[PDB]
Amino acid sequence: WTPPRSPFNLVQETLFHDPWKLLIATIFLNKTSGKMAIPVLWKFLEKYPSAEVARTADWRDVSELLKPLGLYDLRAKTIVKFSDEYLTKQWKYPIELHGIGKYGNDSYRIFCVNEWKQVHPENHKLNKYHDWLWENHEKLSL
DNA sequence: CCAGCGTGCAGC
DNA sequence: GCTGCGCGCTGG
Ligand SMILES: [Mg+2]
């Protein structure tokens, strides 16, 4: 399953190969424009390439990185805790993990596994992609 | 200038 | 069901 590229350019379209990275991106986008958050994302991943690394980070350091995105202490603590549970807690969908809600879970179920037909998003950007998927899945050979 | 917005979430 | 978290960006 390879989710198709869309005219709406969701960053999820390029991150689906690594579910942890995709989920970190949804967190970066919590009430934050992609325009500011995505460049900081690359800086984050460069310094924290994996859940393994992130789960051992000092959140205060992660917060300094996240500063110009707002919600910096909240999300830094979320990211460390999320990463820890991602690796050590038993889970089937990432909504069971701290810091991932319906929007992160819906993203996961559209991009990281083949469950887009069962997903019913309430996120505007996700709906755009999802509606477009329903309209075009035949043409796209899905 | 400056009120509202931007691919939410947990805790209450 | 509501609130705290929070910055730079955005556009009248
Ligand atoms: Mg959760």
Could you tell me the residue ranges of all domains in chain A?
Answer: 1-142
Query: Amino acid letter at A16?
Result: F
A97: helix, strand or coil: coil
Q: Where are the beta strands (DSSP E) in chain A?
A: none
Neighbours of A110 (CB within 10 A): 24
Neighbours of A106 (CB within 10 A): 24
CATH H-level superfamily of A1-142: Hypothetical protein; domain 2 (1.10.340.30)
Query: Amino acid letter at A65?
Result: L
Resolution in A: 2.2
Query: Amino acid letter at A68?
Result: P
Angstrom distance, A17 CA to B9 C1': 24
First to last CA, chain A: 9
**Quick one: how far is CA A28 from the chain centroid?**
8
Query: What method did the depositors use to determine the structure?
Result: X-ray
| A71 beta carbon to strand C: under 7 Å | yes
